Structure 1
Amino acid sequence: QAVTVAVVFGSSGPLQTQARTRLTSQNFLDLPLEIQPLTVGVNNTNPSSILTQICGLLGAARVHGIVFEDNVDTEAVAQLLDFVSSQTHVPILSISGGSAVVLTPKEPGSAFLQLGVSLEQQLQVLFKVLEEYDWSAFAVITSLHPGHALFLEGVRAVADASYLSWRLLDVLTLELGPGGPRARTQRLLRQVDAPVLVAYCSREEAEVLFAEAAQAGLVGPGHVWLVPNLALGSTDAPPAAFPVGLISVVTESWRLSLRQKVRDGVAILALGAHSYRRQYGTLPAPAGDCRSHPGPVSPAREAFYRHLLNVTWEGRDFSFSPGGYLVRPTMVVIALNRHRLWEMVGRWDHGVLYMKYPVWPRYSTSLQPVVDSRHLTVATLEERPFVIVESPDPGTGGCVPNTVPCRRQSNHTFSSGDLTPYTKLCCKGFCIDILKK
């Protein structure tokens, strides 16, 4: 009666015995009813090995779902997992690595699910950051990495659906990538005049582009770079030729250990099975096998698939969109600090963006800050006819168009660490209008 959930591991330093005595009799008293985990690891991630191990696993123990983890480097593993899930109708969840990168189209019979975000949500968060710092001018730089058209479509949709009328400058493309001639792309990189640049490329292409930009002088103050998770690569080891102040948006997994992620995925599967048991008297049917040909999908499989889309674990929203990815997750805007470490900068709650820096630190060389002489710090006080202070709209979290944002200090409460949420407010009035003019 225990839900047979199989956890399969990639090649991220393959070891599972050290993490085997932590789930057999665990994560069952937390909330799920009864689980039985089967752990098998693959030290090689080629398609033959993946198919062989998954098919041998599905040939015994009557598995209910599969939890997959990859490194980060490989990207065809997601498509292979989608193929297996469609051919066997077994629910598969992708936890981390390159397999967690979202495939926008999936096979109709596939139950493959990814704990990741589409490019549209990442672009939404990045444009929220741009609105927060009023960076209405930006330029889009893309490579010929597959999906660049999708990235441009998402950028266009976000810009049109917003209310700020963003100024989109000339769109640039990197042709050769790894085999860059350093002449044509150099000429294009020297032909830019934007203070904010949004880049689409893979990890290797990101390194090449950033090195060429460093040659072209697009690093340091006066230039900000925003990239999605594709260029991020491994968060624990930021490589050389990555400009300080690089901005990205990742889900709440970048500082979570492998055991936490695996137990989270098993919890999602168990919660879905528990909901199915609550509605349907019997447990969901296990997957049959790799062999034979399960052409169509039984309503038993479909009910299970629809019963694990809406799963809440430890107060975290793990709702899955019909495209098999998280629809309303809690995002985190991370940035590369002067110590060459990916540092948490902002949060994305239900619909609001919470930043940590009111002024973006523009490190010029290595660690040295700048002052941005054209920037002023203004101290005010609340007087009813002159400076009126109110709270921002809770639904949106932003300020009214006729107001401006304004925070407040406090006595004691040592704020050097900047691990302190804003008491963010909006100011309007006679003095504020004078200041705007």
Structure 2
Amino acid sequence: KIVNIGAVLSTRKHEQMFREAVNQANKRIQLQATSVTHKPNAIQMALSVCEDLISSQVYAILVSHPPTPNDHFTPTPVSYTAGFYRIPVLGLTTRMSIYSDKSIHLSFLRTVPPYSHQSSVWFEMMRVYNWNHIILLVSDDHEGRAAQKRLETLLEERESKKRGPKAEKVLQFDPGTKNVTALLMEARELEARVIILSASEDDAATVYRAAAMLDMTGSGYVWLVGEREISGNALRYAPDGIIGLQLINGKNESAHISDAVGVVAQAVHELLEKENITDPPRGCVGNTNIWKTGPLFKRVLMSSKYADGVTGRVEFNEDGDRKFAQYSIMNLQNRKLVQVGIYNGTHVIPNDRKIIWPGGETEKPRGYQMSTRLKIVTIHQEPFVYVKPTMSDGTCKEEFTVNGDPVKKVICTGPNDTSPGSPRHTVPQCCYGFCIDLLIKLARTMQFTYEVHLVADGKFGTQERVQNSNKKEWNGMMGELLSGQADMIVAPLTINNERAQYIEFSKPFKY
């Protein structure tokens, strides 16, 4: 019996290389080869596949990428036409962002790993430099969602079993828009300084221009970027220090073809010892049936089979993705792509070369710098926090106590001079009392500097269903403390059980 291994390549040199590779692999039944060039329209190409590529149909088709930067519309129709009959697909170089779904694509095997493994490498690198704070931001809808989900399931599963990295803020924006200064300033207003990004080429150039406008390179902003953003179109406007990654053998199509034909020959030799073989028909028209050999062959291929080739040990995870790839840690050493090291498996290997960081700093920057300007919220309560209008000079009238000591007034900035009929922020109204006096003693003891502003709603806060939406949100002080509008609550706030779920109440000031 003969097994005609179908294929679809873009250049005749690749076809000759595949012919030589299958002739070499025939040394170890018989094997053959069939190749069809890529068409500008995927419909006619799909017809040629259904008519010529699967004219024998007993094989695992392999597909490559065209020089076009699409990389999705060209590999998707072969995968669809092969998964119709549950025929496995081999992928040499593809955008593995969407192709990792077992429901959309039934059977699909790739050679290059997706960016999920790149996020895993990012996490492994973070585990070395003790960076426990990072603000990521994704741009693409699916690719960005997949990268975010991968990073979240990596950081959360490790946190369950020091403090351990917290992704401080996850930002998302449109990959087609250009106004991101709002999100840039929102990220700047945070504490973390280890911004990891995962955008497209044009989006990378736009965010680089935005960061250069905001000057996010003052020797404190560590950058971690992907391979899709180190291209020349974005490297032309890329800042220094932008540590990036790059996979080895990204354009070597012949080596990928050799590895694919080797592993498929190994899979054929392993599966030929089975019992039932449902040979696909010699023609795709009129044959409405499922090949029983397809799923079982894919299962016995992905289970344990592997053939060492140009990339060494090649293990497939449970998604149709080749694992244990090679990542080159590249740093922008003054517009020079120098290899700081290599990555393989789970261990990171640095070449011990001259490694720098953005901003000219030759030392490892810290993860973050804690701010000493934390906002403080306060309520107006009768003997705790007095609220009196300020004098016209700018300060307010200072009085003496019963003994002759100062009264320790603080300049509150809350809207207490207006009514709910016309809410408007008014002039600062100096405030004083028992727990504002407590607040000054805490500030001198731990040497921080604080401002204060009263609440907007007025109530202390509880859980209530919103008027229009479905989710429940807190109110007043609790809402302003949770939603990043206040870092502390210096006011009489009775400790409860419904509030300790999301708040960490210290030891009680007074019973």
C-alpha distance after superposition, 1:37-72 (max 9, x if no partner): 22221152x431431231222352445121111144
Mapping of residues 372-411 of structure 1, within 5 Å: 372=363
Pairwise CA distance, 1:129: 0.5
- Cα distance in 1 for partners of 2:62, 2:147 equals 28
Q: Match for 2:300: what amino acid?
A: H
Tell me what 2:417 maps to. Answer: none
Separation in structure 2 between the aligned mates of residue 223 and residue 197 of structure 1, nearest angstrom:
7
Contact 2:208 2:237 in 1 (8 A): yes
1:91 corresponds to: 88
- SS at 1:290 equivalent: coil
Alpha-carbon spacing, 1:34–1:245, altered in 2? closer, same or farther (3 Å): farther
Q: Structure 1 residue aligned with 2:356, among 361, 365, 376?
A: 361
Deviation at 1:96, TM superposition (A): 0.8
Partner of 2:144: 148
Aligned counterpart, 1:168: 167
Structure 1 stretches of 4+ with a deviation exceeding 6 A read 281-284
The one-letter amino acid of 2:108's match is F
Q: Tell me if the contact between 1:58 and 1:288 (Cα under 8 Å) persists in the aligned partners.
A: no
Contact 1:220 1:243 in 2 (8 A): no
- Cα distance in 1 for residues equivalent to 2:165 and 2:38: 47
Kindly report which structure 2 residues correspond to 1:18-57, keeping only aligned pairs within 5 A, or say none. 18-30=13-25, 32=28, 34-44=30-40, 46-57=41-52
Aligned to 1:64: 59
> Displacement, 1:206?
2.0
Partner Cα separation in structure 2 for residue 117 and residue 67 of structure 1: 16
Residues 347 and 282 (structure 1 numbering): CA distance in 2 closer, same or farther, change over 3 Å? farther
Q: Distance in 2 between matches of 1:126 and 1:76?
A: 29
| 2:3 is the counterpart of 1:7 | no
Q: TM-score, normalised by structure 1?
A: 0.70
1:382 maps to what in 2?
Answer: none
Query: Which aligned pairs between 1:27-426 and structure 2 lie closer than 5 A?
Result: 27-30=22-25, 32=28, 34-44=30-40, 46-71=41-66, 72-98=69-95, 100-101=96-97, 103-107=99-103, 110-162=106-158, 165-175=164-174, 177-181=175-179, 183-188=181-186, 190-191=188-189, 193-219=191-217, 221-231=219-229, 239-249=235-245, 251-254=247-250, 257-277=252-272, 279-280=273-274, 285-286=279-280, 288-298=282-292, 300-309=293-302, 310-314=304-308, 316-326=312-322, 328-338=323-333, 340=335, 342-357=337-352, 360-364=355-359, 370-372=361-363
Distance in structure 1 (CA, Å) of the matches to 2:210 and 2:29: 55
Question: Which residue in 2 is equivalent to 1:398?
Answer: none
CA-CA distance at 1:333 after TM superposition: 3.9
User: CA, structure 1 residues 349+56, in 2 after alignment: closer, same or farther (shift >3 Å)?
Assistant: same
The more displaced of 344-353 and 193-202 is 344-353
Task: Write the letter of the residue equivalent to 2:221.
Answer: H
SS in 2 for 1:222: coil
Using the alignment, how far apart are the partners of 1:49 and 1:229 within structure 2? 33
Gaps of 5+ in 2: 367-511
CA distance in 2, matches of 1:219, 1:290: 58
* Counterpart-to-counterpart distance in 1, 2:299 and 2:289: 19
Aligned to 2:423: none
Give the root-mean-square deviation of aligned CA atoms: 3.4
Letter in 1 for 2:212: A
Corresponding letter in the other structure for 1:8: V
Instruction: Say if 1:138 and 1:197, in contact at 8 Å, map to a contact too.
Output: yes
Matched-pair contact (CA < 8 Å) for 2:308–2:314: no
Deviation of 1:139 after TM superposition, in Å, equals 0.8
TM-score (norm 2): 0.61
User: Offset of 1:321 from its aligned partner?
Assistant: 2.9
In structure 1, what is the Cα distance between the partners aligned to 2:178 and 2:242? 22
State the number of aligned residues: 357
Mapped contact 2:225–2:242 kept (Cα < 8 A): yes
User: What SS class does the counterpart of residue 315 from structure 2 fall into?
Assistant: coil
Distance in 2 of aligned mates of 1:33 and 1:207: 53
CA–CA distance in 2 between the matches of 1:49 and 1:329?
36
Q: Is the 8 A contact 1:58 1:290 kept in 2?
A: no
Partners of 2:70 and 2:258 in 1: CA distance: 23
Structure 1 residues 132 and 109: CA distance shift in structure 2, 3 A: closer
